[PDB]
Symmetry: C4
Subunit: 302 residues, 4 copies
Amino acid sequence: VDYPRDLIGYGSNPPHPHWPGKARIALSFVLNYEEGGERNILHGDKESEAFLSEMVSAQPLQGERNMSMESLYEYGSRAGVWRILKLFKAFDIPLTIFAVAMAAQRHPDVIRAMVAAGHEICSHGYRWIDYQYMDEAQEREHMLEAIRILTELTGERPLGWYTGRTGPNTRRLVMEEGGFLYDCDTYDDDLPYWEPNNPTGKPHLVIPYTLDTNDMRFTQVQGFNKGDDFFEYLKDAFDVLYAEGAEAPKMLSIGLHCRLIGRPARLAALQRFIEYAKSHEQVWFTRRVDIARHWHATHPYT
Amino acid sequence: VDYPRDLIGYGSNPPHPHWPGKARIALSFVLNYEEGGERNILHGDKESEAFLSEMVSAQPLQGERNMSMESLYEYGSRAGVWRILKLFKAFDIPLTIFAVAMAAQRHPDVIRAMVAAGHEICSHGYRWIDYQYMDEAQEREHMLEAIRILTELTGERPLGWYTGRTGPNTRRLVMEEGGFLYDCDTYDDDLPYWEPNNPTGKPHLVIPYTLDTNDMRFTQVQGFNKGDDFFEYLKDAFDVLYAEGAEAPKMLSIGLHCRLIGRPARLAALQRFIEYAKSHEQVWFTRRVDIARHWHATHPYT
Amino acid sequence: VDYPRDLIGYGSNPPHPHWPGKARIALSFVLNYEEGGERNILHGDKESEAFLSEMVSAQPLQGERNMSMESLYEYGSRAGVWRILKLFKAFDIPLTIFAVAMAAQRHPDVIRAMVAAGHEICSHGYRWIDYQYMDEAQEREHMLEAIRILTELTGERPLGWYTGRTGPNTRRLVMEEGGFLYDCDTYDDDLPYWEPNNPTGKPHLVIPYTLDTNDMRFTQVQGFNKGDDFFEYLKDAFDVLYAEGAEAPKMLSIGLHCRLIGRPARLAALQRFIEYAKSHEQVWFTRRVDIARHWHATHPYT
Amino acid sequence: VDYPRDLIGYGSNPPHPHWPGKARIALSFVLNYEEGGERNILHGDKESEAFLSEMVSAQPLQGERNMSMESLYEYGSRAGVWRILKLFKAFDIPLTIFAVAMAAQRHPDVIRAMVAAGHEICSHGYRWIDYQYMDEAQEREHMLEAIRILTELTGERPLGWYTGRTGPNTRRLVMEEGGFLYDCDTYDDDLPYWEPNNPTGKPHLVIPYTLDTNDMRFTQVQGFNKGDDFFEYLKDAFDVLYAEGAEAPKMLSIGLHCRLIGRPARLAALQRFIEYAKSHEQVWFTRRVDIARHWHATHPYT
Ligand SMILES: NC(=O)c1nc[nH]c1N
Ligand SMILES: NC(=O)c1nc[nH]c1N
Ligand SMILES: NC(=O)c1nc[nH]c1N
Ligand SMILES: NC(=O)c1nc[nH]c1N
């Protein structure tokens, strides 16, 4: 008898994080880069992409090419990413980039442009796909293959990972890997915690990510019609955490995608919230690597 | 010739409930607990969970494990439930817990923590699944099995039931069971009524539940984009009942799930409504068991 | 070479209707009654109902019984219909009832209760289903069978029809039938027009209905989250027609369903609009039969 | 090794367009005409239409006729188109018509009526369908067949194209064709650019279109509930571009469909935005052909 799920975690007693600056909230802004990395027969894929694009009802096409799907992704790398990088640089808030190995190759300039802005480049896997079914063998060297590309693309290896479309073996291999300080393949808490089942023994930091305060909802069945739906949602999820942080601060992730929030219609909202957030004192805008290194010092694994 | 459906009920003449305090409305706040109880091959299930999670387009996976799906549920037990329990305790309004036997085992501390707050623990079945197809035999001892777990988990047996994903045999077996005062496997009225087709002869109270003033809509195709959609909906459904209650009071159910409303973004709305509701006199916040025992005394079965 | 579709109609020259009272708009409020008439193995159906219910992602079940689905419909006949009848009687605006033969049997009291309020009872077919595939033979006597039930249910035959889920043969048979003054199985205009392809030769009036200013959208993938979405939509579609009616009045249909708008949450919106509409002079609230008889006198078939 | 996708385009350096009048934004209003051109067994199709109609969950029917689907399209040609033509003529802003060959035949009067208003008639293909799978041979003379119809329908050939539901061969054949100045079968930028892979050698202008600032979203799973969702979206996507245009102007496409925006409920929003847009100086309302000819002179292919 063994349950491979921790349904309880900290329970009624979440640790206090003591965010630098005495912030009542810690905000993680995340910009993915998957454009170019997505499904495509050109990449070897047996079908075209269908996930997160204006084509909200798109289906995959076996041994076909979704020219439309492709164009919409192309907006993310071509136009969307730039516009967002100005927004964040504009307010001096830093980013964590969930960058997919194959996309980074295909647009190394923009990666190096991020790296120079001081944004942290976290690994988003070798390719933007669903690992759920992948064989353990072929999945393990996607990771090391991804680990190699970004080190050579960036100058330093990635000490963070996030697959997203995880298969079971995924979070294990991350931890078995070695050189990662954290992962984000959880949406299970409002705070970071050390992975309880690390075979490796070495401390492993978990920084849960989000599928609700994620701009991906602008293209899902359930999701924002206008910008303001995203914004009101972010304000809400801010207000409630800030209010809690008067005695017990927590964090909040914000997921952005080049092809979605980068569209001017939706960018308006993202800036709206930034300004909102910025108007409150005791807010720590930060990269996830900093949250990991903050945790290490603050609440070292025991 | 026999129609097994009562399409008429009270017709033009709903009974007046005389809610304690002379309230013009009776409000039933319900917090489900299904996290840990849901579909999973670890539980014997042939496929992973797909119902009510941020993964609004998730499909079931035969003999697979949806690590993502699991994590999102894990948020309900780990973080969501606690935050909500503070909200309700915060306003001194009481709850009725629709608790699923298997989840209660997996987190007995939080169940006992509820029981101590004074919230009523109603049965939500042995496992959170779709009974629609289950064989009468194997379904009947899920119930008694569920009936045993919560008595031993709580100190008293459950005198209420709600499966949700009912099969035909379900509401019968509930009534054939014996020790239940009511059930909630109806969404067919704005007031409680005695089950008209109880083979058992013994009075059986029906307290219709809701799939519209339910936070579940935040993850369905049709459903709230921002918090305010839930809230405006609740205000509306409040305003119209309160206005009616000037001469004929009725009730209103509110369905909450740990993994959904417990997310800070959506909690803001839930509190918004509570405050709204609280600002009106002649409102009876109550547990369903109290509504059953209120009915017994007020409008005894004949 | 023959195109069985009139893509042009009145073109740039819609006729002026000269609505009684010199109204700048004519409003058709329609309340369906399908509850009890819907799909069900008890009715002979090979599967349960799945269309328009809170169960926004429900699927049909072959030789099964959706107890949940049924309960939600039961709300329409049990509670929803009554509450709405008060709303409309409350403002003295009259209704056109799209009543399905099988539902009318199952709740004759409420039908006769409508008839006494002075509302017009239009035929909605024998059963609430999809005729698209039905054989011409078995479909033709559904209609006459439906035609018989409501005459005996009401005192007068139905001079109007609307199937909704039409099959090709449907609108023909309506016209071949004989005693109907109009039908509504079109959503193709903002005004009534005589059917251009009536084999019968006898004048046939078309009164297009709506699938957008229909409360059905509260349960479809695309559709209102809160009441206000319905209301804002109705105000818009009112404002634009009223503004046009300064020189060229038109009509507007409003589709309501017992099980959907009758829920207090959504009723609030419906009343909101009524009040809105009521606040403007030169608005003709009317039954469709009156619109037919108005047309006859005003713009007789040539 | 050859990647058939330009993921980078202008990168960090989009060209300045110097819009006539020194406008800080260039607005492309587009009204499609597909009604009559859509899928239908009468047209040879093996199934009925299912894309973009109030029937938001409609499925295609093999060798069948969706009478309902048809009626809803019929609203676009019969009523919707006219009402919109007044709106745009009302404000003196000009249109680009994406007109589908088969629809234009079926309603030549309305086409010639557009042509006389001074609106540009761009080709939207021979038939409104999905070319993705079409054989290169039979697809190539759809285009020339479409090219012939509109020249004879309009007086001048179409120097622009947009299929929408493109297959790979599509944009190639457009360029191989010869007499087109641009195409719009991209959604990959916020500015026009010369096609980088034109086999023909001759300059080919790309004017990316939109699937987000498109009224089509009113009938998709993700999309506007009320008018205001469309409008707020347009204001946002306007505000952000206008703000950028203080130093670097760009354009914005607006997709409209007769059967969707032409409904009074949604027309209100479209006018709302027009007025909004109109209230700002330095806005260039224009046809796409003018944007092509503007580009030619301003930023000639090299
Ligand atoms: N964050 C993401 O875009 C993602 N990565 C894998 N699956 C996803 N949804
Ligand atoms: N209330 C519930 O979460 C539920 N229980 C069974 N099916 C459901 N939707
Ligand atoms: N109006 C209706 O509810 C209807 N009737 C047949 N199909 C429908 N959608
Ligand atoms: N713009 C359009 O309506 C379109 N044309 C082809 N596919 C589409 N969605």
